[PDB]
Structures are given as C-alpha cells and as structure tokens.
Design a protein around this ligand. Structure first.
Ligand SMILES: Cc1cc2nc3c(=O)[nH]c(=O)nc-3n(C[C@H](O)[C@H](O)[C@H](O)COP(=O)(O)O)c2cc1C
Ligand SMILES: Cc1cc2nc3c(=O)[nH]c(=O)nc-3n(C[C@H](O)[C@H](O)[C@H](O)COP(=O)(O)O)c2cc1C
Lengths: 350, 350
C-alpha cells in the first residue's frame, strides 16, 4: 500500500457548510476505493493522511491537486511500501480543530500552527528538487552520490553591474528576481532543475539525453524575455533586460554536497565549469546562446545550428567547438548584447 | 513580553522518572520567574512555548540551551512584543503524548511527528542565516533589501579536478564536504556567514568593519587544513587537500534573491566578483591567501602584510593592489599550491 501525507492552504475562506461538504464527499469516495485516513483543518490550513492501493491513492491525490478550494499543496511524506493501515475504521474522518476547545488540544493546536508556519517559511528557501524527491517517496538525506550524464545550463543578466550602479537597491532586486522567475518557470516546465543562483547567474541542469529540451528551454527564455522587454512600462529597467546562456554536456557527480549543517542536492563536475565559461563568451562571440559541439551532436531535432569558433580555456588542454542556433529570436537577443553595452543613461533616468 | 517556541530532540532515551523530573523543576522555576507556557514530548521529541519578561525568558532559554538532556534545539518563533499571555494559569504544564491515548489525539500526534520530521529534513538544506534571523524575532521573508558594506570571502580546493578524475564518486563528495565543514565551522565562529556553495567553492561574508575577523578566519582555515592533512591516514586523499582564499571589501545588496518559489537570503554586488577573481589568482601569484588593499587598510591589527602585485580584471578599468600575509602557515599553505599541481599519481593510488 501507499500512504500520503500533505498540507495545504485554503484558497479562500471556507464556511462550515463547505468544510463538511468536503468531508462528506471525501468519506464517500474513499469508502468506495477502500482508502482510509484523516483530514484535519486548522485556521485555514488542511492536513491530510490517505492510505490504500497506490493506483487509487494517486488518482484521489490527482483530484485533490486540481481542487481549487485549496492551494500551496505540499506532500510531506510518501510511503510506498505500507503493509498495515494507520486508520483502518475510517474511510475519511474529518476533524475541525477550529471548532475544538478540548483541554490538551489548545497547546497542540498552537504547536501545529507554529510548526506549519515555520515549515512554510523554510519551503521558500528550499530547492524544488527536494520536494520532488520527497513526493516520489524518497528521503533526500539518504541519497548516495552518483555519476550521471547531464546537460548543464548557465545564464546571467547582460551588463548587470550597470543595473546595480544606477538603480535603487529595491529595484535591482526586483529586476534580478523577475529574471530568475522567468528562467525558473521555463526550465522547470521543460523538465530541467534550477539548482543554484549565484549573483545574477542561474545554474540548472537537464538529463543527459535531453539536449533538445535544454535548447528549447533556452530559446523559450529568450522569447519570454523579449515579451517582458517589449511589454514593460515606459522607462522601466525591464526594457533593457537581456540574458546570455551557455550549455555544456558531461558526466557530473549528483548528490548532497555541503557542510554538516547545510547542504544542497546538486551537481559537481567539469561540465558545470564549461557551461559557465561558455556563457561568459556570449559577449565576445556576439551570440546570446552558446553551447558545445557535444550538446549540438546530442540533440536529435533539426535545429538551425551555426558554428561560431574553436576556442580554449582550462586546464585539460583541449579546444572546444562552440555553436549557436540562427533564427530571428537569437539574432534579436544577440543584438541585445550590443544594446546592453550602453544602457547606463537609460537606467540613470528610471 | 517575549514568547519563544522551540523544538528539540532527546540526546538519549529518557525514562518517565526523568521526563517528570524536567516538568517538576521547570514548573517550579518558571513559577518564580512568572513564566508560563507548555512543554510537550512525543517519540523522543520536545516542543516548548515559554512566555514572560524578555530578560527572564532569555536566561531560562540559556539554561535550556546548555541542558545536555536534549540536542538539535531549534527556535521556530521568537515574538518580542507580546502583551497578552497564551497560557496564563500554567507556570509550565507538561504534556506527554507518548502516554496519551485519547481519540482525536492519535491523528494529531501522527501529524505533529510527520511535520517535525519533515521540518528536520528542510533544516539540513537551509542557510544558517535564516534560523539566526528567526531566533532574533524577525520573519526573513519580510526583510527588505539593503545596501551594506561587507568583507566577501571566496575559497576553493586546489586542483579539485584531479580529485574528481581520480577518486570514486563517494570519496570525491567526502573530500568536498570535509572541506566545506572545516570552512563553515571556522567562518561561523569568527562571526561570518557562509552564504553559498558552488562546485567546490565557498562564498561567505563578514560585516564591513570585520576585516580582522575575516583575515583571522582565513588563517585559521589554513591552520585547520594543515592539521587535517598531517593527521589523515596514510594514502588518504585528505593528505593533499589545499585551499585558496581571496577576500574583498565593498558595498553589496543584501536580501532575498531568487525565483518565486525558491530564494536565498544572500548578497549581490561587485565585491562578490572581486573576491572570486582574487581567489582565482592564488595559483598565478603562488599565495594561498590573497586580498585587496581595501581589506588590508580596513584591518586594524598589525598583520605582517606583504604586497604582491598591481593587477586588473573587469570591467570598471581600475587596477587593484593585492596583498597577502607572510607567516609560516601561509608560506606552507602557499607551497601546497605547488604540491597540488601533481597529485594525480598520489590520488590514483588511494
Ligand atoms: C482539503 C481537501 C481534501 C480532500 N480529500 C479527498 C479525499 O480524501 N478523497 C476524495 O475522494 N476527495 C477528496 N477531496 C475532493 C476532491 O478534490 C474532489 O472534489 C472529488 O474527489 C472529485 O470528485 P469527482 O469524481 O466527481 O470528480 C478533497 C478536497 C479537499 C479540498
Ligand atoms: C526539554 C526541557 C525543557 C526545559 N524547560 C525549562 C523551563 O521551561 N524552565 C526552566 O527553568 N528550566 C527548564 N529546563 C531545565 C533547564 O535546562 C535547567 O535544568 C534548569 O532550569 C537549571 O536550573 P539551575 O538554576 O539549578 O541551573 C528544561 C529542560 C529540558 C530538557
């Protein structure tokens, strides 16, 4: 059997009518599916444990995930090898702690709420991969390191130092966070993982057989930033927000890396350095998107590849053939590298 | 008034004798201090809320922090402007959920435990600064960005690519994590903050008037790594673990930086780039510790400074005078840069 524990937030205030309507329908449908567990609600927060056959649990959770009556749904625990139920006589008992006034309940209710609020804070500072791993039924702390082929993605804001020199601190942070949000949304949708931000740089990766998705993600980012630039208000710093992007491919180490008290689930390897070094060359090469021949050859779609140069850095003493893709979007984005050389006056005036 | 909520783990199994001994003494001392609240215990976990006058709360918490009967003590919430108690008739009521069997308690007990276990996982992936901010009574999500003078620290492992080429993946990760742990312990003790790991690199910062502590932290790291190298088993990769370090000083932006779902409380600015670029020069300059004249002049202690070079990168088109400190430890660590040029055979044989 499978047992799923999640928490969620009310999308909007819910009356007593609606709360017991949820319990009513949930209990009837879980009875049919031989699913048991408990649904708790407290100050506009839901907690639910559900247990039963994995296929039935997944289909129920799928409906729960689509229910517009709550949001911020976060699976805290997925157990996929359960052989004894924890709540057998209870298709879906519902408990409302708001209407509860019992003696020892008052301190436990406060603790539940404070734990949940603290957990919601830490979620905002936690890599998305950690919650994905948890939702697959794995404790991330017990993942052992492995060598894995990845496509590594590195991007940054062109002429970012001009933004920091010219704009108030709150506007600098607004620009960087807008950029990070654009990149993160598209990378994640294309099946990649944003693993680190450093300064105004994004580091991300894709499965090693997903060069096509990494390339498409990169082109979509350039496309989204074009929409952002040309839709921004007159005088907005967003009108001169341009990105450089570099991709590389290689065997890296994936796992928990860090100090005793603080680690990241992330990657380590030469392809990280290569992606960052390629991304740095975007200005010299006058191309917003650059990538290695290994990425080029790994792709299976008929992209309009253009050879740029044979270049070296390192280290390992081997030259690297560097490519881009030639289309209207990359030409426009590459012209943006030139525009961004002289945005100081424009930014001085926001 | 102040109200403090924390969680902790039993250091070792505790009997019923010891649990109520804690409640007994806690209630008597809190009665004296006019402190109220509740202490809960569940499967070897403590939860406590304490409220009263700030000075009395801090002294009680100080004793609690030193009590060897629990560990992993983590403050989840500090409220410093409380004007109404939450548990007035209760100097220190103790509730034991293990011995509890009530009806609606069983699901809430399970939820408490699952929330706590999940919270303990996220703690391991959370920057230390976030818990410090929380313990000072501030929600980190509501900190606005500010310009601040910092000393920025950047360090990495010399010839790290050789480690990755020669060692099994689990040993590579063991080495990097050992290094990260050494740096993080010393930086934190010296009043700095480790804010980011990237590859085998540590990025950290200190208050802008703390160049002396940043320099001392750097020298202590070199000292600790010497002890690590010369105490490691025969053939251990740790015997050839060397670091480079660079320090810079400048006005940076500090705040919440990232995407909508994932941010870091960290810094952004030119001094981050300068520290990393200086750290990269350690090999060319044959010096394990390098820093800018701005760091040198900001220090007030009579360090044995040595001028190394007048160098440029960027960007901003200004040359930077680069210094180190000349003592036995830096000379030994700098000779290690040379040794690390040719550790491939040594590492091939572990
Ligand atoms: C907090 C919450 C918990 C829910 N729990 C369950 C559940 O345990 N089982 C279930 O079948 N539906 C549950 N639902 C409702 C589903 O989202 C959905 O409304 C219903 O199952 C779909 O019924 P349908 O087959 O007509 O589409 C829950 C909804 C909410 C808001
Ligand atoms: C889980 C736990 C909770 C505690 N809570 C309190 C408390 O609320 N108030 C208190 O005075 N001591 C509390 N203590 C005990 C203190 O750590 C310490 O033993 C005692 O207060 C010191 O007494 P002293 O003045 O003789 O040094 C707690 C201990 C543990 C393990």
């Amino acid at each position: 059997m499978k047992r799923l524990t999640y928490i969620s937030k009310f999308s909007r205030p819910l009356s007593g009518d609606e709360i017991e309507a949820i319990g009513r329908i949930s209990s009837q449908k879980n009875q049919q599916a031989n699913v048991t567990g408990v649904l708790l609600c407290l100050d506009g927060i839901f907690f639910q444990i559900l247990e039963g056959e994995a296929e039935k649990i997944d289909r129920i959770y799928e409906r729960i995930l689509a229910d517009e009556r709550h949001t911020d749904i976060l699976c805290l625990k997925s157990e996929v090898e359960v052989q004894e139920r924890m709540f057998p006589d209870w298709s879906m008992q519902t408990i409302n702690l708001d209407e509860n006034t019992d003696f020892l309940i008052r301190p436990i209710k406060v603790l539940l709420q404070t734990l949940t609020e603290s957990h919601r804070i830490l979620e905002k500072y936690t890599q998305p991969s950690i919650f994905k791993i948890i939702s697959q039924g794995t404790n991330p702390l017990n993942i052992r390191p492995k060598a894995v082929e990845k496509i590594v993605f590195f991007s940054d804001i062109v002429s970012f130092s001009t933004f920091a020199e010219k704009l108030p601190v709150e506007e600098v942070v607004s620009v960087v966070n807008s950029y990070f949000s654009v990149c993160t949304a598209i990378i994640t949708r294309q099946g990649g993982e944003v693993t680190k931000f450093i300064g105004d740089c994004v580091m991300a990766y894709f499965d090693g057989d997903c060069a096509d998705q990494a390339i498409q993600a990169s082109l979509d980012i350039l496309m989204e930033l074009e929409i952002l630039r040309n839709s921004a208000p007159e005088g907005s710093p967003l009108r001169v927000l341009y990105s450089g992007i570099g991709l590389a491919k290689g065997k890296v180490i994936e796992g928990n890396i860090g100090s005793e008290l603080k680690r990241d689930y992330t990657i380590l390897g030469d392809a990280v350095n290569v992606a960052a070094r390629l991304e740095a060359l975007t200005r010299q090469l006058s191309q917003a998107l650059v990538f290695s021949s290994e990425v080029k050859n790994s792709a299976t779609k008929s992209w309009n590849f253009i050879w740029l140069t044979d270049s070296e850095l390192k280290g390992k003493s081997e030259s690297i053939d560097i490519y881009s893709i030639d289309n209207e979007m990359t030409r426009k984005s590459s012209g943006g590298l030139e525009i961004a050389r002289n945005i100081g006056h424009y930014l001085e005036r926001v």
